[PDB]
Design an enzyme around this catalytic site. Structure first.
Site, PDB file in Angstrom:
ATOM      1  N   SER A   1       2.779   7.290  12.858  1.00 55.15           N
ATOM      2  CA  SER A   1       2.518   5.882  13.083  1.00 55.15           C
ATOM      3  C   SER A   1       3.799   5.080  12.936  1.00 55.15           C
ATOM      4  CB  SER A   1       1.470   5.344  12.112  1.00 55.15           C
ATOM      5  N   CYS A   2       3.746   3.864  13.462  1.00 53.66           N
ATOM      6  CA  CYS A   2       4.758   2.845  13.237  1.00 53.66           C
ATOM      7  C   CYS A   2       4.069   1.563  12.798  1.00 53.66           C
ATOM      8  CB  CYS A   2       5.631   2.583  14.472  1.00 53.66           C
ATOM      9  SG  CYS A   2       7.156   3.557  14.517  1.00 53.66           S
ATOM     10  N   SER A   3       4.838   0.714  12.115  1.00 57.72           N
ATOM     11  CA  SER A   3       4.356  -0.603  11.735  1.00 57.72           C
ATOM     12  C   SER A   3       3.807  -1.326  12.954  1.00 57.72           C
ATOM     13  CB  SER A   3       5.512  -1.394  11.110  1.00 57.72           C
ATOM     14  OG  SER A   3       5.148  -2.721  10.779  1.00 57.72           O
TER      15      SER A   3
END
Ligand SMILES: Nc1ncnc2c1ncn2[C@@H]1O[C@H](COP(=O)(O)O)[C@@H](O)[C@H]1O
Ligand SMILES: Nc1ncnc2c1ncn2[C@@H]1O[C@H](COP(=O)(O)O)[C@@H](O)[C@H]1O
Ligand SMILES: Nc1ncnc2c1ncn2[C@@H]1O[C@H](COP(=O)(O)O)[C@@H](O)[C@H]1O
Lengths: 252, 256, 256, 199, 186, 244
Positions: A168-170
């Site tokens: 995931s990423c922010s």
């Protein structure tokens, strides 16, 4: 040198710290650090922390808490109120620092109240060293010169077979710089991306452009996606979007 | 009887006292090196990995790493496969004449070493008369010891899963000569051209792929289930393989 | 509290002295077989794999290999499910009468075996109403030791990771009776027709697939995310399935 | 007047019927081994006093070996026969603005929607034309056309057929891969492939 | 107009003794109409309308089309369904302009002030999609985002052009090239 | 070319008065425009049949093409499902239905004084004496297209028609309900851009036949078609891998 030498350096580093706080995310990299520390210092000297927030799926949080309890660690969740900081809130390009500063600060506050000597992260070899090297955070895999193959080779040798695969990423990465992050629109993106993920597309980004959603898929997949066009249109229109579109250039 | 096939494997090593094992990174070649190290010692076993124009250096370099992690004194050797005119012109038996040159050099590095003979990692499963590399092996006087001590394909996992062995090469290889029809002459240039075209195809997300060489025409073999997912890349693959030298880039309406 | 969960398992194993294990290849049955092997010895453990009309032999052989490689004295037994007219006519309560017939044979294999109990690999997760085997299993005095030491699916994942277990059967199964509407009676013929259609579909590259039987119409359930990649196999699948007996071969617009 | 079925050759015949009469105007339609008989038959029908003649294009060693001048030599050999049919019949073409053989035979250029090309356009120039492979190329194209692809080319590369389709259509084609593969393999091709480029 | 209605008028209409072209219409519409009119045998002459002159057309109010139509008929004053096909098909009625044109202002949102420059890139964006074989297509203008409405039945036919369609609309000024998951108006 | 034609006018002029069975197809149109041009508006009567087995959408376009061509057009209603063969869909239904069709036509032709009943083909006909003049005048599928483009004919029905009874297996009883369910599911598919399509009726299973060249383009409409046909009564909506 060998994988076994890269490992003696890891085990030697843990024995000196005697007591650590691990920032555990569920990823393969973060998992190998927690199991190694569990195997060296024992459950009483190791505290596992999973951080939930407004910017990360709660599905990811719940899976990381569970994967840590399974390893035999004492796990503790902590929730960061990321939008309270105005840099993260207004989505400046430097936003990803200000969230990391909030992240390593909370880890060190849990580390100080815990008996722990340092905070360990699970990053490996191959964008902000100004932030770990401000809270005294240690990247132990990176220090023993582990690459992704040294990590799988040691994890597959510890019988470790469970982790989060889709990374995931922010969620701030879905909003153009300058647009202010609200609970309303953030909830809207993560809702759409949860839906796309449920159609069998683990890597997906719904980019936010006010009334227009622009879906970024891996080009290899844009073919399999046509059967779901009409549903994704209804589903994302129901989440607030007036126009649902697909980026012809794909993800990345 | 799993250990009745392990003791038969260990006992043959002591009689040899010294050996030089040809390691390829596979599970089979690896259990050979680990058992010889555990039986004959770190000083009596010499590991050899061969690089060549017919195999990607990625496979070569990954085998050398797998040897250093296992702890053997590992050494690479480079075979000029194209010096033999059989391999260069791709006769149908060229798979044999290449393997002979391989075991030829293997007998040479071991004879200079303290080793008595060279050990390979073929198994009873590869006990076919039509398997190519056995011929040259029994000619060059090498030995497939696991095949002699009675290991099958699942019987090797049980010894591997019992020595804590892992971290072996899983992705399998072919001599790049399979991309050239019988009779076409192999040059460094066109070999490079084939291997470049294929690396590009894999990096688009197609690990199983063949770019078959037909002078000016490239003929791409994809697994049929992926040809649907492939269209989005047609034009790019067309121009990208054209830059590698192909005049026509084609997709085999057949499979793989 | 896993350190004391394992001990509850061994204490139950030590108390039984001799057990007959129902092995299926799944992760659940393996840790039980592996644990009972490590506790009572190879001679005090009998692992049983059931073949029947409702499950592919493909599965039977992979469980027999996983048991023999695990180090068990493995034994097959064959159930004639179509003898019970409940399973045969495919009433909705079928998979109970199938489970009932399953545990009976196992208790008979165990009764002649020195075994004291019949252990299956059910866990605490499936300790619920609405799961078939549980009624029949209990009515038969079969013991689910993972359930007794309070192992959940995650406590099972973690105990495997300490016995070096990294190999079990991942492809999960359904009774082939799920492919027939409730009124339809099961023949030896129509089962093979269905089991063949699915194996062919699986060969192409669709490991998740269902062929629904409606007399002359086969209805294919594919995962929608994959129905795009299937278009190239339309004509092939249409022909290959017409030869198995279906007059019409269709693809369900809904999906799996 | 040399009739091909085209609009250009067509206007000449109707005017020639209207100007010189049916008996003082003679219609000639050419058959060959380089063109589909469907094309030949519609031109004789589109004219229906018409008379057919068959030209042996492969007798010419240039056309047979497929030099770039084969198209010339076929045009040169065409008007040669045209001057011969006129002697017994007691030659007009329909070129309209928009040859070095046409004017080399005293032909006059006084000026069906789906147009045709010489099947030599399917063979690389080095490739020599035989009765056998010409027949397979024309057959392979007919099969493709029968699947609902009116625009198609089968390019001949000895062992390999290279199909040129309109790129917009390659998506709709996948359902026919195996059928096209098998059907062209029985027509002689060892490898049936699709040009990732285009028409 | 070239259609079945305006054609019949020419061929029915008095002895042998006007098709507009505007910025807001492809020059293809004006060129094929002048060929379809000289074909019926009449003296055909063009006129061109600077629609951006009137502030309504350019400000892009829903009161554009009325105002836009009104400026059309003015130069006309200056220069001077089943029953109709039954009188056409008796005259060997050759062809009618079936593919209907649209004011390119429909490609822009209500209120977006019309530039030549951004109008241009819309009509360029549309010609390019048409050349690849999509006659029915609209490129809708959202500042930096290009939203392409294709008839849903033709989106499976489109994937081979994606990267090529992409990099080419980009070279026209779009920062983002998207395909509407909903299709054409319908 | 004008030879196939001369046989046609000599045959029409010989009859003087006729009755023409109109279907809207290109064939029946060349028959109707020719009879109007040879025998006159007062000597030719055009008949179109409505029934349960053909969409009313198709019927109404059949009446329009006749009024535009200038014929005196007449509708008639066939109660096909009254015949126990058509209703129970015996294999011979195709015949008993055509028998019923030419029967009403010969009587509507006998009633208006006409000499014969003309249809446009290029054992049902020979029991009623229905003359097929295009076939008698030596017309092939290419010969019929060419006379239309030379008579200026520019409007006919391109979407080909079938009796809906072909969507039901032999033995299935046709109910009024059952026909409408099939006729609707097909109209929906057609409205998505598939003018050539069949929804085959199999109790709870609808089996859709599409032209294979188009099954690639249909995947975007899977879900829409699946639900829309489930709401019409079908429990399962499937796609026939054979095609049409
Ligand atoms: N939600 C999280 N909760 C706890 N630790 C985390 C979390 N995310 C990342 N970490 C740490 O960050 C490392 C990788 O950083 P990144 O890929 O940017 O998330 C992991 O290996 C962990 O050490
Ligand atoms: N590139 C290589 N370099 C050194 N030894 C090799 C190599 N490839 C194969 N060997 C030997 O060949 C055996 C299997 O043959 P193959 O898989 O056909 O190449 C291995 O077990 C090794 O003993
Ligand atoms: N084919 C089988 N043969 C032998 N034992 C089985 C078989 N299937 C299940 N068992 C046992 O029964 C349990 C329940 O199986 P299942 O209902 O498929 O989840 C498994 O976990 C095994 O312990």
């Amino acid at each position: 040198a060998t994988l076994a030498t890269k490992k003696a350096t890891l085990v030697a580093a843990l024995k000196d710290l005697q007591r650590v706080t691990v920032a555990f995310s569920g990823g393969i990299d973060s998992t190998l650090v927690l199991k190694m520390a569990l195997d060296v210092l024992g459950r009483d000297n190791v505290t596992a922390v999973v951080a939930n927030s407004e910017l990360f799926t709660d599905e990811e949080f719940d899976k990381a808490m569970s994967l840590a309890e399974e390893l035999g660690a004492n796990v503790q969740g902590t929730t960061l109120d990321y939008l309270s900081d105005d840099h993260i809130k207004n989505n400046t390009p430097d936003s990803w620092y200000y969230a990391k500063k909030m992240f390593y600060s909370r880890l060190n506050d849990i580390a100080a109240n815990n008996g722990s000597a340092a905070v360990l992260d699970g990053m490996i070899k191959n964008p902000g060293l100004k932030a770990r090297s401000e809270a005294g955070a240690r990247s132990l895999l990176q220090e023993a010169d582990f690459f992704k193959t040294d990590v799988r080779a040691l994890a597959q040798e510890l019988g470790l077979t469970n982790w989060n695969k889709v990374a995931s990423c922010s969620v701030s990465s879905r909003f153009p710089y300058g647009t202010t992050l609200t609970h309303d629109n953030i909830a809207q993106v993560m809702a759409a991306e949860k839906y796309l993920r449920s159609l069998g597309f683990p890597t997906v980004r719904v980019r936010f452009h006010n009334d227009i959603a622009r879906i970024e898929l891996p080009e290899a997949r844009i073919g399999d996606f046509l059967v779901f066009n009409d549903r994704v249109n209804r589903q994302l229109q129901s989440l607030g979007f007036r126009y649902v579109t697909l980026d012809l250039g794909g993800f990345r």
